[PDB]
Amino acid sequence: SQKNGIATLLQAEKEAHEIVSKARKYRQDKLKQAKTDAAKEIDSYKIQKDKE
Amino acid sequence: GNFKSKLKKAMLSQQITKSTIANKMRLKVLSAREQSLDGIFEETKEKLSGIANNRDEY
């Protein structure tokens, strides 16, 4: 009836929205990793040059 | 690049200091030689003044 054509369908919409939200979270955390890893590597290079 | 620039500056400073020391050594040596020559000249002058005292050979 209305229930299996509306409520379950909206829940499937919620599943899809959850999947895309998780994709966004992957993107965001990956970009923050791209920044933080570079930040840590530049210091490693800087100290290596400075010590010598 | 910054590391290279700083290293080049250090090398320049070391080079100039070393050259300065090496050069001034030569000045010291030449000064010593001229001092010895001046001592010899003073010896000769003193002998000439002494012989000037004679009243017959003069």
Swiss-Prot record, chain B:
Domain of life: Eukaryota
Effect of S19A: Reduces ATPase activity by 88%. Prevents assembly of V1 subunits at the membrane
Protein's cellular compartments: Vacuole membrane
Quaternary structure and interacting proteins, as annotated: Homodimer. V-ATPase is a heteromultimeric enzyme composed of a peripheral catalytic V1 complex (components A to H) attached to an integral membrane V0 proton pore complex (components: a, c, c', c'', d, e, f and VOA1). Interacts with VMA5; the interaction is direct. Interacts with VMA10; the interaction is direct. Interacts with RAV1 and RAV2 components of the RAVE complex, which are essential for the stability and assembly of V-ATPase.
Function (record text): Subunit of the V1 complex of vacuolar(H+)-ATPase (V-ATPase), a multisubunit enzyme composed of a peripheral complex (V1) that hydrolyzes ATP and a membrane integral complex (V0) that translocates protons. V-ATPase is responsible for acidifying and maintaining the pH of intracellular compartments.
Protein family (similarity comment): Belongs to the V-ATPase E subunit family.
The protein's name: V-type proton ATPase subunit E
Annotated source species: Saccharomyces cerevisiae (strain ATCC 204508 / S288c)
